[PDB]
Design a protein around this ligand. Structure first.
Ligand SMILES: [Ca+2]
Ligand SMILES: [Ca+2]
Lengths: 223, 223
């Protein structure tokens, strides 16, 4: 997260870090046994870390659990990043508490102009790389589809929404991928892709969660 | 390497990739049993990969060897990046050939205006991250010390040299660290740090190898 602020500790309780020997993607806890992330974050072995604030320091609220089942959306297109959604079933249920909590699935598609919360341990620079220790937060609005499209001529599907600032300076970056976009307490997007980081005219693109609720439910039920 | 070109295969034979389960730094083969890198690339276990072109594909010329002894310069300052030089003794001597060859230590400090060759598997973007598969190359000049200093007021020591373009667009980035800066066939610098990547007014900084020859020799001899 470029140009965000440090979240208050454990203030984003559904935020998880996907770890493969290092943090590589975020995710969201949607029930005591399941995490939703980006399909582009797939790896054959993943340790899910919940209750984190400082990814490099054991603060006492961490829960570390291995991924049992990792399910990429059957129509994920690694080329367009269309259907960039994946589900992770935890090897075991976590203890839900103050610092480890679930986030609701969306009851509807949020309108353009809604203010959402984006979080992650992703790169904090507009140029070069700086990996933060503490979880970063960013308040940003949902843009109208037409600005989305204009920005990435021919690349936006209806399973994608733009979130951000057309003027630059703030945004999601590498390492924020698969993390949450929460609006009025519901998960509206999954951090997916953008061009550069925090650059003018290049908003962030998110997987539109409101398009997969069914998919999410069925999968969880069948698995 | 931002704005460089793809090296001709095995055309930079002394170039090594430092691997810890993934490429994280470059280095230079200076003899059949030793690699010079950046101290900031230290890790307690490293596999050195020589004869690479495509870091993700086994092309048939690779030599993979574990690091036996990893020696950071005793005055390395993790804060200023002063003395950012490290030596790696390979668990065993490599077979020197066409694609795996050594690069000479400098007989003298190169003058400003000399054209050097920079190579690496580092990030190729000015904003955001793109890790290349093939080794990237960049021809760039050595800048006068005064431009160096002006650029990073209070941060340059005499063990540092700037290499690059004051106008931006070309440069070393994350992942090129510890790699070579070769001028007229001799190792003149080790990729060390810069602000952003490929940005105007922010040249790259390299460890000045001509200041450590003695150190290099003694170490090799004593170890
Ligand atoms: Ca922690
Ligand atoms: Ca290879």
């Amino acid at each position: 997260i470029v140009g965000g602020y440090t979240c208050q500790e454990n203030s984003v309780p559904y935020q998880v870090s996907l770890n493969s020997g290092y943090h590589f993607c975020g995710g969201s806890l949607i029930n005591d046994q399941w995490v939703v992330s980006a399909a582009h974050c797939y790896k054959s072995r993943i340790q899910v870390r919940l209750g984190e604030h400082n990814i490099n320091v054991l603060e006492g609220n961490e829960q570390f659990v291995n991924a049992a089942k990792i399910i990429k959306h059957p129509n994920f297109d690694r080329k367009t990043l269309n259907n960039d959604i994946m589900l992770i079933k935890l090897s075991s249920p976590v203890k839900l508490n103050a610092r480890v909590a679930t986030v609701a699935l969306p009851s509807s598609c949020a309108p353009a102009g809604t203010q959402c919360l984006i979080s992650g341990w992703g790169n904090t620079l507009s140029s070069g790389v700086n990996e933060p220790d503490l979880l970063q937060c960013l308040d940003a609005p949902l843009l109208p589809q037409a600005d989305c499209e204009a920005s990435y001529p021919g690349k936006i599907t209806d399973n994608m929404v733009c979130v951000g600032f057309l003027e630059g300076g703030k945004g999601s970056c590498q390492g924020d991928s698969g993390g949450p976009v929460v609006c009025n307490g519901e998960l509206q997007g999954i951090v997916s892709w953008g061009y550069g980081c925090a650059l003018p005219d290049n908003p962030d693109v998110y997987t539109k969660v409101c398009n997969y609720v069914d998919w999410i439910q069925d999968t969880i039920a069948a698995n």
